[PDB]
């Protein structure tokens, strides 16, 4: 038999069906490194202080599937719904040294919940939630309509875990939807913080990849690296959750 891997994936639901791909990635990883998936569906909300209040069973339920998780991840799922919770889920694994992925609003999200809570810009948003938002962190941004197809994300060094997974690449090519982005105009407040902005677009207007620095693996990332895994080439980044969810990083 296999050693067991637990999974903690914070969204909206069980495996409902546009989870699919997001399984079949996390499943090669697993795969890979010879552990069985145990995989736990979290809908987000019930993390939050409003399910304590009114659902109490509920919302000790879900949070000792989040803290009894070897790693967690936030999908890119689209909305405004759970996004509290997600935040919750976040600073848990961030503070905690839980391995952590982020993929698309996962990243964004990410980013606001450090500007919040280790740069103290307390009001840091989204105005994709808030369009009046006072400290607009993430901001529309759309090509001139929505960042789509097959594209090119660039390192902007070697320092870098992700890197490291994809082969030392200096450029990787993923599938994208999105229009949300990092705001330039924000981006020096992190300079000597420990999140580091490390890929781009080819433009150098969007940061497309995150990752903290005393963490074991915390990563964000824009695209959704789902979309181009297989049984004999994981995903990286969903191939790095699982190797640090496992404690197997270091060895490969």
Same mark, same amino acid.
């Given at each position: 038999?296999? &050693? *067991?891997?637990?999974?903690?994936?914070?969204?909206?639901?069980?495996?409902?069906?546009?989870?699919?791909?997001?399984? &079949?990635?996390?499943?090669?990883?697993? !795969?890979?490194?010879?552990? &069985?998936? @145990?995989?736990?569906?979290?809908?987000?909300?019930?993390?939050? #202080?409003?399910?304590?209040?009114?659902?109490?069973?509920?919302?000790? =339920?879900?949070?000792? #599937?989040?803290?009894?998780?070897?790693?967690?991840?936030?999908? +890119? +799922?689209?909305? /405004?719904?759970?996004?509290? +919770? &997600? !935040?919750?889920?976040?600073?848990?694994?961030?503070?905690? #040294?839980?391995?952590?992925?982020?993929?698309?609003?996962?990243?964004?999200?990410?980013?606001?919940?450090?500007?919040?809570?280790?740069? @103290?810009?307390?009001?840091?948003?989204?105005?994709?939630?808030?369009?009046?938002?006072?400290?607009?962190?993430?901001?529309?941004?759309?090509?001139?309509?929505?960042?789509?197809?097959?594209?090119?994300?660039?390192?902007?060094?070697? @320092?870098? *875990?992700?890197?490291?997974?994809?082969?030392?690449?200096?450029? *990787? =090519?993923?599938?994208?939807?999105?229009?949300?982005?990092?705001?330039? @105009?924000?981006?020096?407040?992190?300079?000597?913080?420990?999140?580091?902005?490390?890929?781009?677009?080819?433009?150098?207007?969007?940061?497309? /990849?995150?990752?903290?620095?005393?963490?074991?693996?915390?990563?964000?990332?824009?695209?959704?690296?789902?979309?181009?895994?297989?049984?004999?080439?994981?995903?990286?980044?969903?191939?790095?959750?699982?190797?640090?969810?496992? +404690?197997?990083?270091?060895?490969?």
């Amino acid at each position: 038999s296999m &050693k *067991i891997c637990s999974i903690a994936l914070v969204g909206k639901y069980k495996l409902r069906d546009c989870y699919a791909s997001v399984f &079949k990635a996390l499943e090669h990883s697993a !795969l890979a490194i010879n552990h &069985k998936l @145990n995989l736990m569906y979290i809908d987000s909300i019930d993390l939050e #202080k409003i399910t304590e209040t009114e659902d109490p069973v509920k919302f000790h =339920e879900a949070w000792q #599937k989040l803290c009894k998780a070897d790693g967690i991840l936030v999908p +890119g +799922g689209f909305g /405004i719904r759970g996004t509290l +919770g &997600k !935040l919750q889920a976040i600073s848990w694994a961030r503070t905690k #040294k839980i391995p952590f992925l982020g993929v698309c609003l996962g990243m964004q999200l990410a980013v606001i919940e450090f500007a919040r809570n280790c740069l @103290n810009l307390k009001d840091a948003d989204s105005t994709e939630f808030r369009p009046n938002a006072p400290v607009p962190l993430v901001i529309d941004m759309p090509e001139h309509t929505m960042r789509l197809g097959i594209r090119r994300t660039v390192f902007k060094t070697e @320092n870098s *875990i992700l890197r490291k997974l994809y082969g030392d690449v200096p450029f *990787i =090519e993923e599938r994208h939807r999105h229009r949300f982005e990092v705001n330039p @105009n924000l981006i020096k407040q992190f300079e000597q913080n420990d999140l580091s902005f490390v890929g781009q677009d080819v433009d150098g207007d969007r940061m497309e /990849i995150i990752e903290l620095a005393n963490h074991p693996y915390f990563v964000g990332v824009q695209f959704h690296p789902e979309f181009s895994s297989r049984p004999m080439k994981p995903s990286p980044p969903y191939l790095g959750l699982l190797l640090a969810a496992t +404690g197997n990083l270091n060895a490969y």
